[PDB]
Amino acid sequence: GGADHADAAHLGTVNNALVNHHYLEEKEFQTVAETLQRNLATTISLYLKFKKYHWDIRGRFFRDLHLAYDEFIAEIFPSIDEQAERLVALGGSPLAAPADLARYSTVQVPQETVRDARTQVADLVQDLSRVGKGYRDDSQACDEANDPVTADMYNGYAATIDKIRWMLQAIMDDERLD
């Protein structure tokens, strides 16, 4: 993918004379950086979305979901600083302003108050299906671009996302969940 938005190696600015793409060729950096910026915005958006649903859930599954969402945040949270800094280490600049989260994330954070357990869980399962396949695909893309290092990070993140996807899909595989 195209990564000009995340590339900091060609800026006209102070304290930037040494920035480069280390062992990656320019086109390889473009491929890898598009995945890192997208996955960073996605991870931050999942933190915000798990919190919004943690705060808004009501009804008899409140303890099940309120506590689960915090456990899932704890699993994914460290990857925010790690993905941002992998991008910086390769000569990028990570984006984290609200407008940039909205543009590059594959996950949308709700603006409405969603009380219903099934509505929350089905939304999250759809997101996590996309994000876990995303990391598997992005791992292969990075390996192909001669970046097995970023690929290895993604292999670990995909295992975590796939695990959370299973747990949430299991909870909603029940006709008595309204």
From 35-43, 88-96, 102-110, 152-160, span contacting Fe ion (CB under 5 A): 152-160
Question: According to the binding rule CB under 8 A, does residue 178 interact with a copy of itself?
Answer: yes
Question: According to the binding rule CB under 5 A, does residue 34 interact with Zn ion?
Answer: no
Question: According to the binding rule CB under 8 A, does residue 74 interact with a copy of itself?
Answer: no
Tokens (6 digits) for 178 = 């309204």
107 with 42: CB under 8 angstroms?
Answer: yes
Question: According to the binding rule CB under 8 A, does residue 9 interact with a copy of itself?
Answer: no
Question: According to the binding rule CB under 5 A, does residue 138 interact with Zn ion?
Answer: no
SS3 92: strand
Q: Nearest 5°: CA angle at 114, between 83 and 119? A: 80
Give the one entry of Fe ion, a copy of itself, Zn ion, none that residue 31 binds, where binding means its C-beta sits below a cut-off of 5 to 8 angstroms depending on kind.
none
Please identify which residue in 64, 71, 75, 173 interacts with Fe ion, judged by CB under 5 A.
64
173 with 52: CB under 8 angstroms?
Answer: no
Please identify which residue in 10, 22, 74, 144 interacts with a copy of itself, judged by CB under 8 A.
22
Distance CA 125, CA 165 (A): 6
Closest by Cα among 2, 135, 25 to 90:
25
Q: Which residues bind Zn ion (CB under 5 A)?
A: 7, 9
